[PDB]
Amino acid sequence: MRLLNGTPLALALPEAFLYHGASVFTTLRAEGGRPLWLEEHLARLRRHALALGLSYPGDEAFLEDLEALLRAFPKAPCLRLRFTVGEGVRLSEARPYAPLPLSLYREGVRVRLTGYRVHPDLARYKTGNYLPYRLALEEARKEGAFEGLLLDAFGHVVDGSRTSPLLFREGTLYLLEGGLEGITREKVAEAARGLGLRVERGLFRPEGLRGHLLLAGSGVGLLPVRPPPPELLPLIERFLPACY
Amino acid sequence: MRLLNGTPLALALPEAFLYHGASVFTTLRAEGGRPLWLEEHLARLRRHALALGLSYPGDEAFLEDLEALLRAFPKAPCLRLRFTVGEGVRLSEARPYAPLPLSLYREGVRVRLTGYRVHPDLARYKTGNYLPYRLALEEARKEGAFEGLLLDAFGHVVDGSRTSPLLFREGTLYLLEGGLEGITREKVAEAARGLGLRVERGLFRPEGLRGHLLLAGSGVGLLPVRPPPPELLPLIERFLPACYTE
Amino acid sequence: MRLLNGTPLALALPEAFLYHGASVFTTLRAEGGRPLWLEEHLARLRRHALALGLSYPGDEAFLEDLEALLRAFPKAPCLRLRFTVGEGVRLSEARPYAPLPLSLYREGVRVRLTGYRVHPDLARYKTGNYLPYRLALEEARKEGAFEGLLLDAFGHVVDGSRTSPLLFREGTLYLLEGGLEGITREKVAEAARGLGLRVERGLFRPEGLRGHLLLAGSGVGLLPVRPPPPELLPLIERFLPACYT
Amino acid sequence: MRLLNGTPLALALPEAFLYHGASVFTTLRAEGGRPLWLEEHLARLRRHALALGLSYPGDEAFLEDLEALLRAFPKAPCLRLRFTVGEGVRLSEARPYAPLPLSLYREGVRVRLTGYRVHPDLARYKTGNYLPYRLALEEARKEGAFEGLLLDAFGHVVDGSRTSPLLFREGTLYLLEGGLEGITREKVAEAARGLGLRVERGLFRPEGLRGHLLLAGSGVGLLPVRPPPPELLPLIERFLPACYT
Numbered sequence: 010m011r012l013l014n015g016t017p018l019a020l021a022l023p024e025a026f027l028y029h030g031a032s033v034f035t036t037l038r039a040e041g042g043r044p045l046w047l048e049e050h051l052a053r054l055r056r057h058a059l060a061l062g063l064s065y066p067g068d069e070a071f072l073e074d075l076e077a078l079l080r081a082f083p084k085a086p087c088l089r090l091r092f093t094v095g096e097g098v099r100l101s102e103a104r105p106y107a108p109l110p111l112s113l114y115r116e117g118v119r120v121r122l123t124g125y126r127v128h129p130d131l132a133r134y135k136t137g138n139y140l141p142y143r144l145a146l147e148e149a150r151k152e153g154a155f156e157g158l159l160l161d162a163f164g165h166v167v168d169g170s171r172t173s174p175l176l177f178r179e180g181t182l183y184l185l186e187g188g189l190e191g192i193t194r195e196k197v198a199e200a201a202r203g204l205g206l207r208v209e210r211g212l213f214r215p216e217g218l219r220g221h222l223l224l225a226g227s228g229v230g231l232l233p234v235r236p237p238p239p240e241l242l243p244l245i246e247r248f249l250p251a252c253y
Numbered sequence: 254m255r256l257l258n259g260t261p262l263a264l265a266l267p268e269a270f271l272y273h274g275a276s277v278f279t280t281l282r283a284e285g286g287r288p289l290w291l292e293e294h295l296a297r298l299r300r301h302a303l304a305l306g307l308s309y310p311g312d313e314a315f316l317e318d319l320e321a322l323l324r325a326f327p328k329a330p331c332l333r334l335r336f337t338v339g340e341g342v343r344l345s346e347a348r349p350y351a352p353l354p355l356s357l358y359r360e361g362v363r364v365r366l367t368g369y370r371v372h373p374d375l376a377r378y379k380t381g382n383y384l385p386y387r388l389a390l391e392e393a394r395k396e397g398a399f400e401g402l403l404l405d406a407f408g409h410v411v412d413g414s415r416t417s418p419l420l421f422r423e424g425t426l427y428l429l430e431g432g433l434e435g436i437t438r439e440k441v442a443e444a445a446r447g448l449g450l451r452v453e454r455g456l457f458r459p460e461g462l463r464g465h466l467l468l469a470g471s472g473v474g475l476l477p478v479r480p481p482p483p484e485l486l487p488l489i490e491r492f493l494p495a496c497y498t499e
Numbered sequence: 500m501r502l503l504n505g506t507p508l509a510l511a512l513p514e515a516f517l518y519h520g521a522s523v524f525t526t527l528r529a530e531g532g533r534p535l536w537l538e539e540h541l542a543r544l545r546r547h548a549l550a551l552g553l554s555y556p557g558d559e560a561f562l563e564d565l566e567a568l569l570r571a572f573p574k575a576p577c578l579r580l581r582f583t584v585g586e587g588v589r590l591s592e593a594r595p596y597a598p599l600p601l602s603l604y605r606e607g608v609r610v611r612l613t614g615y616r617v618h619p620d621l622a623r624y625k626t627g628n629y630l631p632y633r634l635a636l637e638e639a640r641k642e643g644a645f646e647g648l649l650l651d652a653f654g655h656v657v658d659g660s661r662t663s664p665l666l667f668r669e670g671t672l673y674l675l676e677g678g679l680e681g682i683t684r685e686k687v688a689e690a691a692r693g694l695g696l697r698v699e700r701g702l703f704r705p706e707g708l709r710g711h712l713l714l715a716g717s718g719v720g721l722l723p724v725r726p727p728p729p730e731l732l733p734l735i736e737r738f739l740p741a742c743y744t
Numbered sequence: 745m746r747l748l749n750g751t752p753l754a755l756a757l758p759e760a761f762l763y764h765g766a767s768v769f770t771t772l773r774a775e776g777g778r779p780l781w782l783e784e785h786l787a788r789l790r791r792h793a794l795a796l797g798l799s800y801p802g803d804e805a806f807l808e809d810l811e812a813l814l815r816a817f818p819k820a821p822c823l824r825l826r827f828t829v830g831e832g833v834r835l836s837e838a839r840p841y842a843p844l845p846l847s848l849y850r851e852g853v854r855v856r857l858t859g860y861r862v863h864p865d866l867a868r869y870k871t872g873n874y875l876p877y878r879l880a881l882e883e884a885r886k887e888g889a890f891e892g893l894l895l896d897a898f899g900h901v902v903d904g905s906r907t908s909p910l911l912f913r914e915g916t917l918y919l920l921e922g923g924l925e926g927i928t929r930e931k932v933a934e935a936a937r938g939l940g941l942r943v944e945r946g947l948f949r950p951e952g953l954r955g956h957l958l959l960a961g962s963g964v965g966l967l968p969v970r971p972p973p974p975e976l977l978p979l980i981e982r983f984l985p986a987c988y989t
């Protein structure tokens with residue numbers, strides 16, 4: 010017997026999935042009824058599932074799900090999509106996307122460096138064990154900061170709770186190493202190279218983070234921390250959600 | 254809109270609970286209708302919930318649940334119970350308990366040391382972020398072992414996937430630090446003192462594990478790794494689940 | 500008094516060089532009497548010596564040793580040269596180069612990912628503290644592989660025991676950071692860009708080694724791990740040791 | 745062919761020993777001709793050699809060397825000895841011990857905390873890859889510190905260049921983890937338990953080194969950093985080298 014808030018509760022989702030965070034996921038934005046970088050997301054999700062010993066449902070199954078989801082909210086310019094894989098479980102959902110105010114891309118947001126660490130074994134996978142990231146964001150919100158930053162076991166700053174951090178300093182856009190290989194950040198790097206900007210990767214500690222931070226992710230595009238450097242205005246423009 | 258395996262889904266539990274493993278829990282054994290260390294489990298569960306910013310629904314609600322569960326199994330020699338807290342979630346469940354073979358407590362089990370780590374910030378809490386522990390047990394079982402052991406960031410051996418490791422050498426019982434403070438382990442410590450055994454806590458590296466390993470947990474009692482020494486027979490007896498056919 | 504294998508011995512070398520691995524070095528290939536990338540090798544040896552507080556004997560001294568070594572092996576199609584610097588020690592040596600079976604450049608070799616680590620302070624320098632590299636190669640050879648790969652303290656795969664690893668995917672060549680800045684790897688990178696390929700540098704975890712691996716160094720040129728990707732065929736040709744004639 | 749400073753040098757020592765720091769070693773003190781803790785030193789040298797794939801030649805080969813060495817000091821003053829093992833290499837040596845000023849065992853010495861790291865794999869062994877230690881000691885000596893301390897990859901303080909650190913705080917003697925398990929430090933730990941003191945191992949950061957630091961090593965015995973705490977006076981006296989009368 011199993012009770013939820015006093016009331017008997019039946020089956021539905023497997024225990025591993027519900028009780029143990031035993032899943033991998035990804036989140037995409039759809040714009041004009043077209044998901045951004047669908048292939049990249051499915052290729053990553055498949056890699057993550059396989060690395061954690063989950064069967065991947067196959068692209069066709071997700072494409073099928075997408076046929077229904079894309080029409081779920083006809084009055085919204087954009088959608089937030091989530092694709093989630095667990096043993097016995099393909100969970101695909103959609104909700105209206107609510108863009109940040111444009112003024113946040115012009116004026117920038119704040120970040121909070123937290124003391125929370127990524128998992129040494131899971132940090133490179135987008136998994137249901139998300140508490141360290143949720144906790145980091147909770148800490149950040151406690152100061153109205155937009156994003157919280159996490160560390161590895163060595164004290165490097167390696168990730169945001171839901172965005173990938175970049176640092177612009179000297180003449181150079183740096184991608185912080187050590188965390189999730191974010192799709193948005195790789196596209197940003199690609200676009201920055203495409204514009205003749207200097208792009209490099211590096212492992213950073215908090216004391217090395219001098220210059221302008223930015224945050225990339227499927228939920229936000231490219232979001233500057235504090236007022237952006239002028240050199241990156243066009244790069245930010247290019248990744249602004251098309252949702253106004 | 255949500256689809257489960259292609260078919261629409263009216264989701265019963267909150268998003269974060271399912272998607273983020275955002276929960277704390279505890280698992281208890283009941284013997285002949287009586288829950289073991291109920292006070293300690295509810296104390297820990299509240300402590301873990303408060304540490305992780307999750308609303309605790311109160312002892313009474315859980316004790317209400319408990320009566321119902323116990324009523325559903327009036328004949329069961331033993332039960333495994335589980336109490337889980339998330340935001341907007343009070344989950345309480347019970348199912349028949351089945352013991353390990355009695356010989357295991359005499360002849361002992363195998364462990365496998367794995368390369369999986371606990372989370373630096375959540376290791377002390379019993380949370381829904383339980384994947385490393387799953388992976389550790391999966392590795393152990395692949396290798397024909399009963400339990401998989403996990404490391405901290407520095408390579409200390411700090412936990413089992415669902416049991417708490419102890420080391421016994423000469424006349425002292427060591428509790429290995431850096432993992433979950435298991436309730437069973439603390440009880441085992443308590444009983445060992447009462448036996449005229451000394452008890453110390455420390456951080457141990459694999460090579461520091463000289464002596465007899467044992468495993469403590471709510472689901473097993475106290476289980477020796479390999480045959481136990483007779484200095485521990487008393488302790489093994491005391492914690493052996495009272496759950497074999499009448 | 501010092502006994503070597505029971506026999507009293509007056510040390511020809513200073514204790515630091517011998518007991519403590521206190522040296523920097525480089526190994527070059529000479530092809531038909533001409534050293535490959537001599538300028539690069541000597542500039543790096545100087546940089547490394549100075550970085551570690553070792554006095555550098557000057558290029559002219561090694562140039563003189565080089566000629567002396569060349570004179571000694573007038574027939575050899577290729578030579579393996581080692582120039583080593585320690586305090587009060589210039590050591591220059593040569594032996595005939597032993598070319599790999601030519602088919603390895605077509606069929607590729609195997610690598611073994613090992614658990615050996617490079618040193619946090621010395622990974623960037625080519626030093627006589629070389630035991631972790633030898634141990635990695637030992638393990639690789641015990642497992643039937645050609646090269647062993649080493650990690651950094653953080654878990655990235657950052658080096659091979661005597662070659663620099665490269666990863667090709669999609670249409671970009673990645674140089675693995677964290678280990679020695681090899682001369683051959685830099686040359687391959689420059690050549691790859693000239694062939695129209697994108698080149699990127701990053702720290703990679705073992706798990707992240709998706710695509711084709713290759714190995715670069717003065718001892719091998721550019722050697723593929725398993726059969727190469729088509730895109731890199733011209734680079735394998737360009738860097739092939741000219742040592743089969 | 746090898747050239748040493750332009751002059752042909754004859755083989756003598758194998759490449760791995762010579763160029764790669766591929767050795768394990770231990771250093772002993774002898775007082776009146778008998779080496780302290782000879783069995784422990786030899787047992788450890790054997791374990792270190794085996795762990796690193798180096799053939800250990802047997803205790804008797806070193807004992808034969810020892811007899812040869814002792815023959816050349818009939819006077820039997822204190823001796824500093826070193827036993828070194830590489831592949832095809834057994835090196836044994838002895839020279840007069842140089843005692844520290846007696847005053848240092850009551851006054852204590854200074855240490856310098858360096859940024860040099862130990863090697864992740866080799867920190868637990870006493871090997872020829874000794875450059876980080878050398879470098880740490882050189883830094884210490886620039887400011888008149890007796891010893892330089894080294895870190896691990898996390899920033900823990902895990903060893904001295906040639907001595908093992910201990911920390912005494914409340915009434916507990918701590919052995920700093922992460923470096924070589926010194927013979928002297930284990931002996932000290934044993935004697936400390938016999939005095940009814942508690943002894944624990946701990947992994948320490950620089951912040952956490954509050955209390956009395958001490959250094960243990962086959963050369964120095966037990967050597968305090970700053971004046972020592974009274975509880976430890978008997979241990980300093982037990983381990984003070986018998987090389988002053």
Ligand SMILES: *Cc1c(COP(=O)(O)O)cnc(C)c1O
Nearest residue numbers: 170171172173191192193226227
């Ligand atoms: C999703 C996520 C990101 C951003 O990745 P994208 O693929 O750009 O959406 C960054 N960090 C963490 C921890 C994430 O979960």
Ligand SMILES: *Cc1c(COP(=O)(O)O)cnc(C)c1O
Nearest residue numbers: 414415416417435436437470471
């Ligand atoms: C539950 C659990 C234990 C055992 O704790 P008890 O309170 O004795 O039941 C040990 N390790 C882990 C990881 C656990 O989840």
Ligand SMILES: *Cc1c(COP(=O)(O)O)cnc(C)c1O
Nearest residue numbers: 660661662663681682683716717
């Ligand atoms: C010498 C060496 C290489 C190869 O470098 P090159 O300069 O290309 O010859 C690669 N890795 C290690 C560890 C080396 O010592």
Ligand SMILES: *Cc1c(COP(=O)(O)O)cnc(C)c1O
Nearest residue numbers: 905906907908926927928961962
């Ligand atoms: C030799 C040594 C010590 C001291 O060891 P003993 O066995 O006590 O002589 C401490 N640290 C390092 C790095 C050493 O090499």
